[model samples]
Target: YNYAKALQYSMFFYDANMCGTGVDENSLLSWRGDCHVYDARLPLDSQNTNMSDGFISSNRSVLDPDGDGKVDVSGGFHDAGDHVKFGLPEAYAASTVGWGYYEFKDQFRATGQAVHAEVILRYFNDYFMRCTFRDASGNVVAFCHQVGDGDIDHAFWGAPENDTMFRRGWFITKEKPGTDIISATAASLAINYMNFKDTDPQYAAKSLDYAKALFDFAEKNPKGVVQGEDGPKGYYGSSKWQDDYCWAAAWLYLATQNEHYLDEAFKYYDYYAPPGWIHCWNDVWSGTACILAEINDLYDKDSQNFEDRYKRASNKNQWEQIDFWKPIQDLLDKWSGGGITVTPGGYVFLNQWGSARYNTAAQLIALVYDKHHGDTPSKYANWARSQMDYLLGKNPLNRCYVVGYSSNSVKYPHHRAASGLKDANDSSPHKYVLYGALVGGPDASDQHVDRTNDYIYNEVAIDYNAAFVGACAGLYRFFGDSSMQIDPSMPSH
Candidate 1:
């Protein structure tokens, strides 16, 4: 299903107190939930209600989600009012439980200080929505959807007739989205979706242009580089705060074969790359996780840009219980077969006696092999294959597939439900299987009542799916997959 429908389905299973923030219980359950949660609480005067969105928009039908009198939630990250109440609440709770949390933020270009909790969910909001896709000016027409084949643009952007029309329209890669302002994953996801407009022959070229425009826009802002646009209030605009900067820079390098972006990549690498304190979706947090993952997957070429990444990581002072930087060391430690003992969340039992996250980490080791060896080491590639075989439950190892329908786990029943079409609530609480430990969600709604009184909760994050995709991409690259759907688009030498 499309994204809009996904949101609708997600609402069907979201927490009433959470999703129905300003919505009344009766109105919500009676098949008349407000169009947008934030809209229901508009013009937030605190007069009749404490909700900002509900009070403003008197017409419950129109719904003033952002509390701005007019409903604009449909236009991306415009409805900032919902950030604290919903988007970031669970994340805050998860962080306190000590799994060491990090989040991505989203926002619009000119919207005021709209903080949606700790991690802002940044995206191309209203003004952008109008400018790029729905605007009459059509100046940003190039950014609109197009389909192409191996080129992707023609198949998706459009064929010759539609292609000419798209170019004839206005095209400007004006200030797009920013990762620092929203969820980093969210931002990359937005870019990926934008890339789907590959039906147009110029879509890839436009992707590059948009990346450059994003960088240029951020560079103009003093807070990020020169300070012009007043960004979010608490946003500490560092070298890191550029609009789609990582995707843009990486795209430039990949699409143009220009090393200029590699230099640019290093400059911002510190920002996007997980700091020593930050671990990516993998067992360890480092810049390489973000850089290597994106670059390898997109470029499919070994830039061999690991020296500086490893040096800074190796020197960092982190918890001795498990060396967070050991993965980097192991990746760099070829001569001595530098294998690390345990990782950041080294609860070996988490992986059912194997560190599944570290098993994922093994893929990074393969990336290093490809970077230096001119060709990926076949043995290491085989090891990653072996690891996946075990992880996915194809092997004899008692590995449990976190996913269902493919495994023999008694917990996962055989019945299947079509996405979006199903009415049953399939949603689960955000699970945190920290360090090989699991904090499963309540078994039933009644268990939640007991949990509030005296129960703990945890489970694995479904985000592991993204990590799994990344690890698989790295392996695919090692095995000489030119598509580089998982790893870098590096040469197959």
Candidate 2:
């Protein structure tokens, strides 16, 4: 789950298709269940062997590694310590969504001795425990690390072992294995801890702490740029977190009313301004300082008037009106001067919505808050309409419950189905929910028949539903209507 706030409802629609009935089989439900869960679906052999084939037997002698104190999969109903599951650290990292499985590996040598060994597994997503063995020695080597992963744990996440440490991972190596020559330790299993505290409200409070770390990092390392080659490279080889910090800081201020966080966040300038804030301040930092200065003001005003002791934590100035219009006007201008075209110096790159669409969503956020213009809203509305057309029209295939970009004229190969991707790229209504909610139009044919096969399909996303919440909330705040009542057919600029 990306946690874009716009896509939560969409995921809701995609999560229920496990039994082949609630949501259509072709919709995102199946994909979310089978592919997105921590263990995904247990290997098919495990499913069949569990009941009919007489293959359901146990491989015993295991302890509840993570120390939940209960030895069995909590929700699965198996007796305590009845089963074991195992896999890489990455797999357990992926499963914290709701259900989970344990994993183990013990490699042996031709000499009948354990050469090198490691035991990697988790009782659940949030709490994972691992140990390793190398050479034959007096004791078994071991170490354990726990990660909060924020409240947004449905996706892959890892941070340091300590609570106060900035997003950093810690590991310690100790005494060697006793009387063993194993190459790698193997033996692991999965479990449904049935406990979902990682997703509860407490997670958000934890996430705020991580976010504060990011701000603190910026204040200390002031001269970094959001550019690709300019400063220390960020993950994914892109500059997502530069201006991202401001947005993140704003979010935290909104939630916690913490002034220290905002003050720390503004130590850098807004990177978007021309002749640019980056040049004025030293290359020591990137981004437009005005944005930093301006948004800090908005955070203060919006966060004020609360009774909580944390309410006065932010500064009290308003968001800059000029700052609101500047970047958008610039974006529109770029498009107007033949910038939107793919031609040289044209509009192709002028797309406010970049390759995967998150950037454009940032543009849309401005409209929801300070920069409200009917035309701006309509432009995005038109864009969302275009996206829906692509998803529902061209690739009219239901990819495990999600609509594909291709036309339904051809079949979406099941082996190459959305769930098969290593990147979680396969379409999932969970993903669409985020996309859909931001568009704010009538749920693009909430239920549509595949244009080609005419296979009936229906799906929705909580992320999208939440998007509608904010969109409708904004529309209602501006006008008396709560529905997406504006029409793009007429221009209101």
Candidate 3:
């Protein structure tokens, strides 16, 4: 069967309690749950921060505050393997997840996954809205870049409840801004605003306001590579902002149906090269192409610009001889030639760290292609299913990559809050299953070691699940009712 539980459980990662949102029994697995709320970092914080002082440098040891003021910056998923709430990656992941839901919404609804899916999307939307602050003149002032220190967050091995190290938040204001982050967040808000417009008009309006204001800031200020002072170096450094600019513009066009936004979208259409099968938090051209194609199909009907741009994005030449879609052709050809390695167990091993993320990205691009062009070769549709099967325990190890899927699935993912169970030993399986989390899959050798200490191959992140969840919806669309019936029951350990 479609194993609806697989998708449902994967959503457990969004249980806000893990990130200082008061504890819930459904969220925390075991010991030390709901120890305290991070009131100082919440939206109404009057302590532990100073907006006027600018960048709040994070010192790992001390509980120090230069000054304090009201900056509504709280809530959002913790970045993978750590408790840090980074803005850029979170925003990107949210956009990807929302787009996935939009594409395969029918499947999600048919499978009874619509509500939980909305919950995940709204989690990011709420946090992004909070980050978009306005001044008295109603001008977009700043966006909170990150909260909690990566270095310190990584130092401890237990749950967030025991996280005694100093936690802080950073913001990018007019003085020091990042177009990529601001615009990407804008894209997320704009897309969600479109989704929620009918259900929650007020929130939709607020999201639209934030989207437009942030896009304006990014367009004007244009900071090249903005990093929060507290952001751990090399983790989320986005070298280019054009993709973010284009993505935001495209969503803005969809949200407001404004031709001006479409004009802006066309201006930056070719700002970046077409994305490959390995799209991730860093690369978003593939996502942009899909959105543009959809927008053109609905709003800009009969525009060759949309098809031409998307074709070029998949690197398909106008003179190609293939009857099958070029994007799918390119991926298969590359993988055959060694760009992507298929393990003996059927796992597509791309990177040892966060392998699931890569597979999901490739899966999503293929799914989007099928949505736009209709899967002709059947190869395109099959490949997407294969990737999903690999994650759901049809691999060499015969184990599910996602937590709590099968008896053989990972019990101890490299997560902090999931640890520190009173009755569990360090080597024991997590006292509570992180139900829906997909861990970094196998290495080049198809070796996947399930251990809490192995962050490289065993960690789970918000970005990692973005496409995996989408791929689940893709599977539903691909095989229809029959595909959904595939047995997802975990094998005996």
Candidate 4:
């Protein structure tokens, strides 16, 4: 009986359901403006490109400049606080959300969040399918690494409807390839394929085809980072390509259940496995632990062996095993050892940056451990609920982190699209309150201020909400007491 509406509200951040001349019949806020929709499916004209015969060269260029049938790549969520769509983070967000839904679809429905779950998953899957660049021969020759120029996008801050930059799409082709990018793309498609396979067979098949092609690209073209003309720098760069391999293998194995994929999973997992911390975009081995653990469960393999390996690996360096946990025994040990920190107010602080993300991860792993090892103490489930409590007006600030949920929740989040009203004080906020958005949060002291300019603590991101929504579903499933539900009339800040 947690904040199910909070899950619904968080998804509105990714709603690119285009408003025709700004009159969006589906707009929850009934807000209208001059924002117009632009088609992203046209062939791109970039000064730098990788297509074989689709692009034409000049002082500039044109789509199908030679008129040979190449066109623009389209679809995907705009990254946090900007209109630009980065392929790496875009795919990672999709995979994370899809995997969350896969785990807790029943909990979502029981908690009345099923429709929102479907909408978000569809948006991710739809964009993933559209990112592919097929040749005249109908083969997926490359995948779009990114769209929109960051420098140009940063030059102006406004709604995507008002955007006018030359939104060129970058591609990762056979000629210039990337292992990590390709593998991450494959992981997204594979996980979505598993979710959609039963309901939407054709789309699931398409996702599998794309997954296989990207996995092949990753395998064949192994060392090059997907950057410099292929991708943007300072965004989603990775040196641990092997972690990408483990991630892709884990998901592909889940989808196909093929021995080859399983063998690949162990091969890469044994080689590049690390502790199971809440990983963001660049460090993906945490995902390796997640999917491999799921695979182990599904196949009835020894999960303790997996946990033991993680313990041994982390212990080898005398590093804190804060990120590594699965077995109820190990989680209990870590909780007592103070490996996972909880503030005096009771919120688990995994890290300062995107603190909500880490708390959500902590909640999810605890929930999973409870499910697998129910013989453990009910304290585990209580611990997970405490993390959820911190998000919903239970912290030292006594403020809800999610917007529109409480009297003292977030108001002036650092988001360009939501910040268009020109209000100066945090009091007169956005015309439409950004519902369901959990801003990057509190420092180690559990102190947080709800100011829009403080990006380190107040920036709202899709990935941030992705984990928040998942944790909400986990709480719905595991928390036995309805007394934990907040008052529905919690006031705004």
- Over 4 Å off in model 1, which ranges? 1-71, 74-210, 222-248, 255-263, 268-379, 393-399, 410-462, 473-493
- Which window of 10 residues has the lowest lDDT sum in candidate 4? 17-26
Best by lDDT: 3
lDDT of 1 at 445: 22
- Over 1-493, each residue of candidate 1 has an lDDT whose tens digit, in order, gives 0111111111111111122222232212232232223322223232322223332234333222234533222212111111111111121111111111111111110111112111111122111232222223222211211011122121221111112211111111223433232222222323432333343335434433444443444333333221112222121222443323443454345445566655554445433234222222221224334433545545443443343442344442232222223444444343113244322222112232223433444444454445444444555556555555444444333433332212331131111110111211233321211111112222222121112111122222222222333344344444423232211221111
Candidate 4 residues 1-493, lDDT tens each? 2555555565666553222232243333433233423434444444434454433342112234356434545555667766667766676677777767777777667655566566566666666666665544335556777776677666676565666666666777666657777787788889878888888899888888888777877876746667744556664455656676778888998888876776666555642333335545665676566677667776746535544444454344334232223433454445534677877777777778788876776565566566655524266667767767778887788878887776788788877667664322344466567767788878788898777667778877767776676667666666535554434442211
TM-score of each: 0.41, 0.36, 0.84, 0.82
In terms of lDDT, which candidate is stronger, 2 or 3? 3
Order the candidates by TM-score, highest first.
3, 4, 1, 2
Query: How big is the positional error of residue 223 in model 3, measured in Å on the Cα after superposition?
Result: 3.1
Candidate 3 segments exceeding 4 Å error: 1-3, 16-18, 22-36, 39-68, 228-230, 301-339, 375-377, 421-425, 480-493
Q: What TM-score, to 2 decimals, does candidate 2 have?
A: 0.36
Candidate 2 runs further than 4 Å off: 1-28, 31-210, 213-235, 239-241, 273-325, 335-338, 342-493
- How accurate locally, in lDDT, is each candidate? 0.28, 0.24, 0.68, 0.64
Query: TM-score of model 1 relative to the true fold?
Result: 0.41
Best by TM-score: 3
lDDT of 4: 0.64
Over the full model, what C-alpha lDDT does candidate 3 score relative to the true structure? 0.68
